[PDB]
Amino acid sequence: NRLLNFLMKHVFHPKRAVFRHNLEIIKTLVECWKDCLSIPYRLIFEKFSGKDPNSKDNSVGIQLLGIVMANDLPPYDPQCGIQSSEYFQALVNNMSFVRYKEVYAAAAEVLGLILRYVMERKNILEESLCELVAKQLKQHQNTMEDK
DNA sequence: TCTAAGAACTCTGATGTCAGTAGATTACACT
């Protein structure tokens, strides 16, 4: 638990090739080696949600949520002191930051795996998260046909 | 006994402007 919270908190690097390596430690550090996780999801929100139109620095929480997804899909936001009605909204809202590809599109790439999880685990949140996604993409449909 | 210098108005042509489009240039990056 102390390892994962540290490895994820300090994951960033100013050099893309190094940052990509720190991230790749996490991928095997979960999927090859721990059930014993208590995944640090209260961090993960802060690692993406801080709004600014020219942020690149939202992107790490996108990529990192993509690691905690891709390891055969543990659940998201169980009882971690944060509200699903705010948490997922930001995670969609990220795809408004159209200045940089890895900021906006990678959020959609994660969400297209989240639906595949929640729908196949038959949980109720796809009744809302599908509406969060649908509501935001409509804002592009009328204004930014390419994005 | 009248012939130009001074008006006046419209019109034409270039220069600069704004918004929007999209190309080519220039950085960024690979272990």
Residue nearest to nucleotide B28 (CA to C1'): A16
Please give, chain by chain, protein residues whose CB is below 7 Å from any atom of strand B.
A 15-17, 20
Distance A53 CA to B16 C1' (A): 33
Taking the C-alpha atoms of residue A107 and residue A93, their distance in angstroms, rounded to an integer, is: 9
Task: State the greatest distance between any 2 C-alpha atoms of chain A, in Å, as a whole number.
Answer: 46
Taking the C-alpha atoms of residue A57 and residue A103, their distance in angstroms, rounded to an integer, is: 8
Kindly write down the DSSP assignment for every residue of A97-122, as one continuous string: -TTSHHHHHHHHHHHHHHHHHHHHTT
**Helix, strand or coil, per DSSP, at residue A68:** helix
Distance A135 CA to B21 C1' (A): 29
- List the resolution, Å: 4.4
Kindly write down the DSSP assignment for every residue of A127-145, as one continuous string: HHHHHHHHHHHHHHHTT-S
Give residues with Cβ within 8 angstroms of A108, minimum separation 6.
A95
**Which residue in this structure is represented by tokens 């196949």?**
A120
Look up residue A77 and give its two tokens.
Answer: 């936001």
Q: What technique solved it?
A: cryo-EM
Q: Name the nucleotide nearest A21; use CA and C1'.
A: B31
Distance A84 CA to B5 C1' (A): 89
Taking the C-alpha atoms of residue A108 and residue A91, their distance in angstroms, rounded to an integer, is: 9
Distance A50 CA to B6 C1' (A): 74
